[PDB]
Amino acid sequence: GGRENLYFQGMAEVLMYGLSTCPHCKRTLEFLKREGVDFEVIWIDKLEGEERKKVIEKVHSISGSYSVPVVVKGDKHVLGYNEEKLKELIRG
Ligand SMILES: [Mg+2]
Ligand SMILES: [Mg+2]
């Protein structure tokens, strides 16, 4: 193995990238929970080594930054905890 995660590869309808220790990421997770949408989360801090580096580069390829949280739906994303932008992403 020789293997890769389905959700890393775009199969979630909604995907969050974050760190479990970050309060902006915590807030965004609680937003998504409350929203009631099926979503997945990748905690980059729970990854190590090349697997972590790969997810970091993926986050960058989506937002153009090395910051989190990033929430992705289809071809759109929100970088950071912003409730208005997250509601627009999920609902619009
Ligand atoms: Mg966008
Ligand atoms: Mg944004």
CATH number at residue 68: 3.40.30.10
Task: Please state the domain count of the chain.
Answer: 1
Resolution in A: 1.7
Which two structure tokens, joined as six digits, stand for 13? 């309808």
Q: How many Cα atoms sit within 13 Å of 11 on the Cβ side?
A: 6
Q: What's the CA gap between 78 and 22, in Å, rounded? A: 16
Q: What's the CA gap between 36 and 47, in Å, rounded? A: 26
Ligand minimally distant from the alpha carbon of residue 72: 1
Q: How was this structure determined?
A: X-ray
Which two structure tokens, joined as six digits, stand for 90? 């999920």
What are the start-end ranges of the E strands in 1-92?
Answer: 15-18, 40-43, 70-73, 76-79
Q: What's the CA gap between 47 and 19, in Å, rounded? A: 10
Q: What's the CA gap between 27 and 49, in Å, rounded? A: 27
Pairing of the two strands 70-73 and 15-18: antiparallel
Amino acid symbol at 43:
W
From the CA of 90, how far away is ligand 1's center (Å)? 11
Picking from 52, 76, 44, 43, the residue whose alpha carbon sits closest to that of residue 62 is 76
Ligand minimally distant from the alpha carbon of residue 76: 1
CA dihedral 15, 65, 54, 30 (to 10 degrees): -30
From the CA of 61, how far away is ligand 2's center (Å)? 14
Strand partners, 73: 76
The domain containing residue 44 runs over which residues? 1-92
